[PDB]
Amino acid sequence: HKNNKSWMESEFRVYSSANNCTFEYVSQPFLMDLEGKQGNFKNLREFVF
Amino acid sequence: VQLVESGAEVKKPGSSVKVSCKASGGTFSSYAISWVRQAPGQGLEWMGGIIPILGIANYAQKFQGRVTITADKSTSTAYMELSSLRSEDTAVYYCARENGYSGYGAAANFDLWGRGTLVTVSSASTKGPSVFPLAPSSKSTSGGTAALGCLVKDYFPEPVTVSWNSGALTSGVHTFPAVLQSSGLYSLSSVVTVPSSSLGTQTYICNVNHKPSNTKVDKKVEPKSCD
Amino acid sequence: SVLTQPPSVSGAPGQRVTISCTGSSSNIGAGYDVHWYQQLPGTAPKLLIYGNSNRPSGVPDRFSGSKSGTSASLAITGLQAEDEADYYCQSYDSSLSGSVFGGGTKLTVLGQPKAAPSVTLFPPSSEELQANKATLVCLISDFYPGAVTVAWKADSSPVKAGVETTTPSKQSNNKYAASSYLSLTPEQWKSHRSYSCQVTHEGSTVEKTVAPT
């Protein structure tokens, strides 16, 4: 934004529509940083599915 | 059949509004009659449904005891009375009808609806309207066509029609819509393009008519002398 | 409230367009029938389909309603020139003790081509100055579509007070027109040098100024 000096997510383009479902679960809240830089990394995250 | 309602109506913040629901023909004292509202910005709410043959009021738990609906079986007319109007009551109500059936669902459906009664309420109540004419200048008219009209300010409530020479000028006339003000007031404009040869021979006059206020003020226009 | 709906859905004139209605397990999933309505902006809504199994008189057979578990679905085939309205969910809720409607979806991709605007700036007349008010009007006409951002300035700072924009209406020649007012007082109308209304339309910025002296 121009008047607001913060990175906000506005383009939510993940899917179009959904007709019918049964499973829906909400996990714990987690805060994230939306500002992107070009420096060196400071953390490491591993995910196993 | 067909159910006809009243027209537009404005009230005061803390007054009692009284509208009605008229039925053409019969088939009114045998089925339930409800009232469904609709406001621009949110969904459609449901206040309650009234049965006219026995007279039992059935409202909802979201609406408190501030509105009452009374029906009559002699003339087939249901009356709606509401008091203590708020700022979020600017919506339109409809006269619906319930037609029950059998089945596993057994849900209330509205097959027959009404016309619609737009009930608005705000500040800046009815007062005397002010008409201000508009004259073209020598710098704003470079060709053989000039634009001029009349400006209506400080008027309430809607609607107000604008006529030109008692409806004799139909070519090039346009009526601008109203707009909400910070004080809760409306304002509109009207302008017609006429050739420059007819400014000094044929005179123009705006006829402002207001039916709820019973004010009919006509005002003439004159061109500017300095520019 | 308890019934949510998507805000908008896109479609093509000739393919199948489906909509989904989600609620709770006590109003739609409990066993109650659903009712779909059409809210046309300018007339009263009518009945389209009740119970998702019968067809009323006067409705085409292109509408198909079904209940798949806890959610209801509405599918149409072919987009004609009358589908510019809103579709709602109505279902009987027991926790609310009555019928509750849904959110409503708008079915309209666009249809508004571009054009070149033309503005007219008109100063207040002599009779308006003694009324202790000043209504600076700025008329815009002959443009397409009706999406104009109106801004004001006094040659030294933008005016962020008393600004108003009206919605444009369709003319007789498939055009739009609107007007913008500015509420001022005659005490400071003669102190400044000039006034102007700046608007934009797809980058096209037209500027017109007047002078009170």
Coordinates of C-alpha atoms in Angstrom, one line a residue:
Chain A
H1 CA 0.0 0.0 0.0
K2 CA 1.0 3.6 -0.6
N3 CA -0.5 5.2 2.5
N4 CA 0.3 2.2 4.7
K5 CA 4.0 1.1 5.1
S6 CA 3.2 -2.5 5.5
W7 CA 2.9 -5.6 3.2
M8 CA -0.6 -6.9 3.2
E9 CA -2.0 -9.9 1.3
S10 CA -4.8 -9.0 -1.1
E11 CA -4.6 -11.4 -4.1
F12 CA -6.1 -14.6 -2.6
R13 CA -5.9 -16.8 -5.7
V14 CA -5.8 -20.5 -4.6
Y15 CA -9.0 -21.9 -5.9
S16 CA -12.2 -21.0 -7.8
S17 CA -15.2 -22.7 -6.0
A18 CA -16.2 -25.7 -4.0
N19 CA -19.5 -27.6 -4.1
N20 CA -19.8 -29.9 -1.1
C21 CA -17.4 -31.2 1.6
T22 CA -17.3 -33.0 5.0
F23 CA -13.9 -32.4 6.5
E24 CA -12.9 -29.0 7.9
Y25 CA -10.4 -28.4 10.7
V26 CA -8.8 -25.2 12.1
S27 CA -5.3 -25.5 13.6
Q28 CA -3.6 -23.2 16.1
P29 CA -3.0 -19.6 15.1
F30 CA 0.5 -18.7 13.9
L31 CA 1.9 -15.2 13.1
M32 CA 3.9 -14.6 9.9
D33 CA 6.0 -11.8 8.4
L34 CA 4.9 -10.5 5.0
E35 CA 7.9 -8.4 4.3
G36 CA 10.4 -9.9 1.8
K37 CA 14.1 -9.0 1.8
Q38 CA 17.1 -10.1 -0.2
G39 CA 19.5 -10.9 2.7
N40 CA 20.8 -14.1 4.2
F41 CA 18.5 -16.7 5.8
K42 CA 18.2 -17.0 9.6
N43 CA 15.9 -19.9 10.2
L44 CA 15.3 -23.5 8.9
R45 CA 12.0 -25.3 8.6
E46 CA 11.6 -29.0 7.8
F47 CA 8.3 -30.6 6.9
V48 CA 7.6 -34.4 6.5
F49 CA 4.4 -35.6 5.0
Chain B
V1 CA -53.7 -13.2 -6.5
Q2 CA -51.6 -10.0 -6.1
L3 CA -50.8 -8.1 -2.9
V4 CA -50.2 -4.3 -3.2
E5 CA -48.5 -2.2 -0.6
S6 CA -48.0 1.5 0.0
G7 CA -45.3 3.8 -1.6
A8 CA -42.4 5.6 -0.1
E9 CA -42.5 7.0 3.5
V10 CA -40.1 8.9 5.7
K11 CA -40.4 9.2 9.5
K12 CA -38.5 10.6 12.5
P13 CA -35.9 9.0 14.7
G14 CA -38.2 8.0 17.6
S15 CA -41.7 8.1 16.0
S16 CA -44.3 5.5 15.1
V17 CA -44.5 4.3 11.5
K18 CA -47.8 2.8 10.3
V19 CA -47.9 0.9 7.0
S20 CA -50.5 -1.6 5.6
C21 CA -50.7 -4.6 3.3
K22 CA -53.6 -4.7 0.8
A23 CA -55.0 -7.9 -0.8
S24 CA -56.7 -8.0 -4.2
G25 CA -59.5 -10.6 -4.2
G26 CA -59.5 -13.4 -1.6
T27 CA -57.3 -16.3 -0.5
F28 CA -56.0 -14.1 2.4
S29 CA -57.8 -15.3 5.6
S30 CA -56.7 -18.9 5.0
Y31 CA -52.9 -18.7 4.9
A32 CA -50.2 -17.2 7.1
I33 CA -48.9 -13.7 6.2
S34 CA -45.3 -12.8 7.1
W35 CA -43.0 -9.8 6.7
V36 CA -39.6 -10.1 5.1
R37 CA -37.2 -7.1 5.0
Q38 CA -34.3 -6.4 2.8
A39 CA -31.5 -3.9 3.3
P40 CA -28.7 -2.9 0.9
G41 CA -25.4 -4.1 2.4
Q42 CA -26.6 -7.2 4.3
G43 CA -28.8 -10.3 3.8
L44 CA -32.6 -10.6 4.2
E45 CA -34.1 -10.9 7.7
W46 CA -37.4 -12.2 8.9
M47 CA -39.4 -10.6 11.6
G48 CA -42.4 -12.8 12.1
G49 CA -45.5 -14.4 10.6
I50 CA -49.1 -13.7 11.5
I51 CA -52.0 -16.1 10.9
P52 CA -55.2 -14.1 10.2
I53 CA -57.9 -16.7 10.8
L54 CA -57.1 -17.2 14.5
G55 CA -54.8 -14.4 15.3
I56 CA -51.6 -15.7 16.9
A57 CA -48.4 -13.6 16.7
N58 CA -45.2 -15.6 16.0
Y59 CA -42.1 -13.5 16.0
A60 CA -38.4 -14.5 16.3
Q61 CA -35.9 -14.4 19.1
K62 CA -33.6 -11.9 17.3
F63 CA -36.4 -9.2 17.3
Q64 CA -37.5 -7.9 20.7
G65 CA -40.9 -6.5 21.7
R66 CA -40.9 -3.3 19.6
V67 CA -43.0 -4.2 16.5
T68 CA -46.6 -5.4 16.4
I69 CA -48.6 -6.7 13.4
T70 CA -52.4 -6.6 13.5
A71 CA -54.6 -8.1 10.8
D72 CA -58.3 -7.8 10.0
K73 CA -60.6 -10.4 8.5
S74 CA -63.4 -8.0 7.6
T75 CA -61.5 -6.1 4.8
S76 CA -58.5 -8.5 4.4
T77 CA -55.9 -5.9 5.3
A78 CA -52.9 -6.4 7.6
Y79 CA -51.4 -3.5 9.4
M80 CA -47.7 -3.0 10.5
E81 CA -46.8 -0.7 13.4
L82 CA -43.2 -0.1 14.5
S83 CA -41.8 2.5 17.0
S84 CA -38.4 3.7 18.2
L85 CA -36.8 3.8 14.8
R86 CA -33.0 3.6 14.6
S87 CA -30.3 4.5 12.1
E88 CA -30.1 1.0 10.7
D89 CA -33.8 0.7 9.8
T90 CA -33.5 2.1 6.3
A91 CA -34.8 -0.9 4.4
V92 CA -37.8 -2.1 2.5
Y93 CA -40.5 -4.5 3.8
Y94 CA -42.4 -7.1 1.8
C95 CA -45.8 -8.8 2.4
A96 CA -45.2 -12.5 2.0
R97 CA -47.5 -15.6 2.2
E98 CA -46.9 -19.1 3.6
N99 CA -48.1 -22.2 1.7
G100 CA -47.6 -25.3 3.8
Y101 CA -47.2 -28.8 2.4
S102 CA -46.3 -32.3 3.5
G103 CA -42.9 -34.0 3.4
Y104 CA -39.8 -34.8 5.4
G105 CA -38.5 -31.2 5.2
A106 CA -41.6 -29.1 5.9
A107 CA -40.0 -25.7 5.6
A108 CA -41.8 -22.3 5.3
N109 CA -41.7 -21.1 1.7
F110 CA -42.8 -17.7 0.2
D111 CA -44.6 -18.3 -3.1
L112 CA -46.5 -15.0 -3.1
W113 CA -44.8 -11.6 -2.4
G114 CA -45.8 -8.0 -2.2
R115 CA -44.8 -4.8 -3.9
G116 CA -42.6 -3.2 -1.3
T117 CA -42.7 -0.3 1.2
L118 CA -39.4 1.7 1.3
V119 CA -39.2 3.2 4.8
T120 CA -36.3 5.5 5.4
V121 CA -35.4 7.5 8.5
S122 CA -32.6 9.9 9.3
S123 CA -32.0 13.5 10.3
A124 CA -32.5 16.7 8.2
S125 CA -36.2 16.4 8.0
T126 CA -38.6 18.2 5.6
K127 CA -38.0 21.9 5.0
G128 CA -38.4 24.5 2.3
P129 CA -36.5 23.8 -0.9
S130 CA -34.2 26.3 -2.5
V131 CA -33.9 26.7 -6.2
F132 CA -30.8 28.3 -7.8
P133 CA -30.6 29.1 -11.5
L134 CA -27.6 28.8 -13.7
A135 CA -26.4 31.0 -16.6
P136 CA -23.8 30.4 -19.3
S137 CA -20.8 32.7 -19.7
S138 CA -18.9 34.0 -22.8
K139 CA -15.8 32.0 -22.0
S140 CA -17.6 28.6 -21.4
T141 CA -19.5 28.9 -24.7
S142 CA -17.1 28.6 -27.6
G143 CA -19.5 27.0 -30.1
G144 CA -23.2 27.3 -31.0
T145 CA -24.4 25.3 -28.0
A146 CA -24.7 26.5 -24.4
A147 CA -25.5 24.5 -21.3
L148 CA -27.6 25.9 -18.5
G149 CA -30.1 24.8 -15.9
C150 CA -31.3 25.0 -12.3
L151 CA -29.9 23.7 -9.1
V152 CA -32.1 22.4 -6.3
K153 CA -30.6 22.6 -2.8
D154 CA -31.9 22.1 0.8
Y155 CA -34.8 19.8 -0.1
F156 CA -36.3 16.8 1.7
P157 CA -37.6 14.2 1.2
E158 CA -37.3 12.2 -2.1
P159 CA -38.5 12.2 -4.8
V160 CA -38.7 15.6 -6.6
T161 CA -39.4 15.9 -10.3
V162 CA -38.0 18.7 -12.5
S163 CA -40.0 20.0 -15.5
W164 CA -39.1 22.4 -18.3
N165 CA -41.8 24.7 -19.6
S166 CA -44.5 22.4 -18.1
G167 CA -43.2 19.5 -20.1
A168 CA -42.7 21.2 -23.4
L169 CA -38.9 20.6 -23.7
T170 CA -38.1 16.9 -24.0
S171 CA -34.9 17.0 -26.2
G172 CA -31.6 17.2 -24.3
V173 CA -33.1 17.1 -20.8
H174 CA -31.3 15.1 -18.1
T175 CA -32.2 14.6 -14.4
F176 CA -29.2 13.8 -12.1
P177 CA -29.7 11.5 -9.1
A178 CA -29.3 12.6 -5.5
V179 CA -26.4 12.0 -3.0
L180 CA -26.1 11.6 0.7
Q181 CA -24.6 14.5 2.6
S182 CA -22.7 14.5 5.9
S183 CA -25.8 16.2 7.4
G184 CA -28.2 13.7 5.9
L185 CA -29.5 15.7 2.9
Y186 CA -29.9 15.2 -0.8
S187 CA -29.1 17.4 -3.8
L188 CA -29.7 17.0 -7.6
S189 CA -29.2 19.0 -10.8
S190 CA -30.6 19.3 -14.3
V191 CA -29.1 20.9 -17.4
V192 CA -30.3 21.2 -21.0
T193 CA -28.2 22.2 -24.0
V194 CA -29.9 24.7 -26.3
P195 CA -28.5 26.6 -29.3
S196 CA -27.2 30.1 -28.6
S197 CA -29.6 31.8 -31.0
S198 CA -32.6 31.1 -28.7
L199 CA -31.2 32.6 -25.5
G200 CA -32.4 36.1 -26.1
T201 CA -35.8 35.3 -27.6
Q202 CA -37.2 32.2 -25.7
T203 CA -37.2 32.2 -21.9
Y204 CA -36.6 29.1 -19.7
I205 CA -38.1 28.3 -16.3
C206 CA -37.7 25.4 -13.9
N207 CA -40.8 24.0 -12.2
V208 CA -39.9 22.2 -9.0
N209 CA -42.7 20.0 -7.7
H210 CA -42.7 18.3 -4.3
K211 CA -45.7 16.2 -3.4
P212 CA -45.0 15.3 0.3
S213 CA -44.2 18.9 1.2
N214 CA -46.8 20.6 -1.0
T215 CA -44.4 23.2 -2.3
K216 CA -44.4 24.2 -6.0
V217 CA -41.8 27.0 -6.6
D218 CA -41.0 28.1 -10.1
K219 CA -37.9 30.2 -10.9
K220 CA -36.8 32.0 -14.1
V221 CA -33.3 32.1 -15.5
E222 CA -31.4 35.1 -16.8
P223 CA -28.1 35.3 -18.6
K224 CA -25.1 37.0 -17.0
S225 CA -24.3 40.6 -18.0
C226 CA -20.6 40.8 -17.1
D227 CA -19.3 37.5 -18.6
Chain C
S1 CA -25.4 -15.0 10.1
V2 CA -25.4 -18.8 10.2
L3 CA -25.5 -19.1 6.4
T4 CA -22.5 -18.0 4.4
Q5 CA -22.3 -17.6 0.6
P6 CA -19.5 -16.6 -1.8
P7 CA -19.4 -12.9 -2.7
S8 CA -19.1 -13.4 -6.5
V9 CA -18.8 -16.2 -9.1
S10 CA -17.6 -16.1 -12.7
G11 CA -19.1 -17.9 -15.6
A12 CA -19.3 -18.1 -19.4
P13 CA -22.5 -17.8 -21.6
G14 CA -23.0 -21.4 -22.6
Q15 CA -21.4 -23.6 -19.9
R16 CA -22.7 -24.9 -16.6
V17 CA -22.5 -22.6 -13.6
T18 CA -23.0 -24.1 -10.2
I19 CA -23.3 -22.5 -6.7
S20 CA -22.9 -23.9 -3.2
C21 CA -24.7 -23.2 0.0
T22 CA -23.1 -24.1 3.4
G23 CA -24.6 -23.7 6.8
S24 CA -24.8 -25.8 10.0
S25 CA -26.1 -29.2 11.0
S26 CA -29.3 -27.8 12.6
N27 CA -31.0 -25.8 9.8
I28 CA -29.9 -27.3 6.4
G29 CA -28.3 -30.6 7.5
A30 CA -31.1 -31.5 10.0
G31 CA -33.6 -32.4 7.3
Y32 CA -35.3 -29.2 6.4
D33 CA -35.9 -28.3 2.8
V34 CA -34.1 -25.4 1.1
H35 CA -35.7 -22.6 -0.9
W36 CA -33.8 -20.5 -3.6
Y37 CA -34.9 -17.0 -4.5
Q38 CA -33.8 -14.4 -7.1
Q39 CA -33.4 -10.8 -6.0
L40 CA -33.6 -8.5 -9.1
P41 CA -32.6 -4.9 -8.4
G42 CA -35.8 -3.2 -9.4
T43 CA -38.6 -5.6 -8.8
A44 CA -39.9 -7.9 -6.0
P45 CA -38.4 -11.4 -5.6
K46 CA -40.5 -14.4 -6.7
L47 CA -40.4 -18.1 -6.0
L48 CA -38.1 -20.3 -8.2
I49 CA -38.0 -23.8 -6.6
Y50 CA -39.3 -25.3 -3.4
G51 CA -38.2 -28.6 -1.9
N52 CA -35.6 -29.1 -4.7
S53 CA -38.0 -31.7 -6.2
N54 CA -41.0 -29.8 -7.6
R55 CA -41.4 -27.1 -10.3
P56 CA -43.7 -24.1 -9.8
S57 CA -45.8 -22.6 -12.6
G58 CA -44.0 -19.9 -14.7
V59 CA -40.4 -21.0 -14.1
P60 CA -38.1 -22.6 -16.8
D61 CA -36.7 -26.1 -16.3
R62 CA -33.1 -24.9 -16.6
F63 CA -32.8 -24.5 -12.8
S64 CA -31.7 -27.7 -11.0
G65 CA -31.7 -27.9 -7.2
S66 CA -30.2 -30.7 -5.1
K67 CA -29.3 -31.4 -1.5
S68 CA -26.0 -33.3 -1.0
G69 CA -25.8 -34.0 2.7
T70 CA -25.4 -30.8 4.7
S71 CA -25.0 -28.5 1.7
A72 CA -27.4 -27.5 -1.1
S73 CA -26.5 -26.8 -4.8
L74 CA -28.0 -24.9 -7.6
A75 CA -26.9 -25.6 -11.2
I76 CA -27.9 -23.7 -14.3
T77 CA -27.3 -24.3 -18.1
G78 CA -26.9 -21.2 -20.3
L79 CA -26.6 -17.6 -19.3
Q80 CA -29.4 -15.5 -20.8
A81 CA -30.0 -11.7 -20.6
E82 CA -31.9 -11.8 -17.3
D83 CA -29.4 -13.4 -14.9
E84 CA -28.2 -10.1 -13.5
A85 CA -29.6 -10.6 -10.0
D86 CA -28.6 -12.2 -6.7
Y87 CA -29.2 -15.8 -5.5
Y88 CA -29.9 -16.5 -1.8
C89 CA -30.3 -19.4 0.5
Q90 CA -33.4 -19.6 2.7
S91 CA -33.7 -22.4 5.2
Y92 CA -35.6 -22.9 8.4
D93 CA -33.3 -22.5 11.4
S94 CA -34.3 -24.0 14.8
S95 CA -31.7 -22.0 16.8
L96 CA -33.0 -18.8 15.4
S97 CA -36.7 -20.0 15.6
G98 CA -37.6 -19.0 12.1
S99 CA -36.4 -18.6 8.6
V100 CA -33.0 -17.0 7.9
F101 CA -31.6 -16.0 4.5
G102 CA -28.0 -16.3 3.2
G103 CA -25.4 -13.9 1.9
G104 CA -26.1 -13.6 -1.8
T105 CA -23.9 -13.9 -4.9
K106 CA -23.7 -11.4 -7.8
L107 CA -23.6 -12.9 -11.3
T108 CA -22.0 -10.4 -13.6
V109 CA -18.6 -10.4 -15.3
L110 CA -18.7 -6.9 -16.8
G111 CA -20.0 -5.3 -20.0
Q112 CA -18.6 -1.8 -19.5
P113 CA -16.3 -0.6 -22.4
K114 CA -14.2 2.5 -22.3
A115 CA -14.6 6.0 -23.9
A116 CA -13.5 9.6 -23.6
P117 CA -15.0 11.8 -20.8
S118 CA -15.9 15.5 -21.0
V119 CA -16.2 17.7 -17.9
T120 CA -17.9 21.1 -17.3
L121 CA -17.0 23.4 -14.4
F122 CA -19.6 25.9 -13.4
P123 CA -19.0 28.7 -10.8
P124 CA -21.8 29.7 -8.3
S125 CA -24.0 32.5 -9.4
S126 CA -24.7 35.8 -7.6
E127 CA -27.9 34.8 -5.9
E128 CA -26.2 31.8 -4.1
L129 CA -23.7 34.0 -2.3
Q130 CA -26.1 35.7 0.1
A131 CA -27.4 32.3 1.4
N132 CA -24.3 31.8 3.6
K133 CA -23.2 28.8 1.5
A134 CA -21.3 28.0 -1.7
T135 CA -22.0 24.9 -3.8
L136 CA -19.2 24.4 -6.3
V137 CA -20.5 21.9 -8.9
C138 CA -18.5 19.9 -11.4
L139 CA -20.6 18.1 -14.0
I140 CA -19.2 15.1 -16.0
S141 CA -21.0 13.7 -19.0
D142 CA -20.6 11.6 -22.1
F143 CA -18.3 8.9 -20.7
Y144 CA -18.2 5.1 -20.4
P145 CA -18.2 3.4 -18.0
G146 CA -19.4 5.2 -14.9
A147 CA -16.3 4.9 -12.7
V148 CA -14.7 8.3 -12.2
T149 CA -12.6 9.4 -9.3
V150 CA -13.3 13.0 -8.4
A151 CA -10.6 15.2 -6.7
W152 CA -10.5 18.9 -5.9
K153 CA -7.7 21.4 -5.4
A154 CA -7.3 25.2 -4.7
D155 CA -3.9 25.6 -6.5
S156 CA -2.1 25.1 -3.1
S157 CA -3.6 22.0 -1.4
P158 CA -6.1 19.3 -2.2
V159 CA -9.6 19.6 -0.7
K160 CA -10.5 16.7 1.6
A161 CA -13.7 18.3 3.0
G162 CA -17.1 18.5 1.6
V163 CA -16.3 16.2 -1.3
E164 CA -19.2 14.2 -2.8
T165 CA -19.6 11.8 -5.7
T166 CA -23.0 10.7 -7.1
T167 CA -23.6 7.4 -9.0
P168 CA -23.9 7.7 -12.8
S169 CA -27.1 6.8 -14.6
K170 CA -27.6 5.6 -18.1
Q171 CA -28.5 8.2 -20.7
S172 CA -30.6 7.8 -23.8
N173 CA -27.5 7.3 -26.1
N174 CA -26.0 4.6 -23.8
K175 CA -23.8 7.0 -21.9
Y176 CA -23.3 8.0 -18.3
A177 CA -23.4 11.3 -16.5
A178 CA -22.7 12.4 -12.9
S179 CA -22.1 15.5 -10.8
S180 CA -19.9 16.5 -7.8
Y181 CA -20.7 19.1 -5.3
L182 CA -18.4 21.0 -2.9
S183 CA -20.0 22.7 0.2
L184 CA -18.1 25.9 1.0
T185 CA -18.8 29.3 2.6
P186 CA -18.8 32.6 0.7
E187 CA -16.3 34.1 3.2
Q188 CA -13.3 32.1 1.8
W189 CA -14.6 31.8 -1.8
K190 CA -13.2 35.2 -2.8
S191 CA -10.0 34.8 -0.7
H192 CA -8.5 32.1 -2.9
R193 CA -7.4 32.7 -6.4
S194 CA -9.2 29.9 -8.3
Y195 CA -10.9 26.5 -7.9
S196 CA -10.9 23.4 -10.0
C197 CA -12.0 19.7 -10.1
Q198 CA -9.5 17.1 -11.3
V199 CA -10.8 13.7 -12.4
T200 CA -9.2 10.7 -14.1
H201 CA -10.5 8.0 -16.4
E202 CA -8.0 5.2 -17.4
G203 CA -5.1 7.7 -17.1
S204 CA -6.9 10.5 -19.0
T205 CA -6.8 13.6 -16.7
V206 CA -8.9 16.6 -17.8
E207 CA -8.5 19.9 -15.9
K208 CA -10.7 22.9 -16.0
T209 CA -10.4 26.1 -13.9
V210 CA -12.5 29.2 -13.2
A211 CA -11.7 32.6 -11.7
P212 CA -14.0 34.5 -9.3
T213 CA -12.3 37.8 -9.9

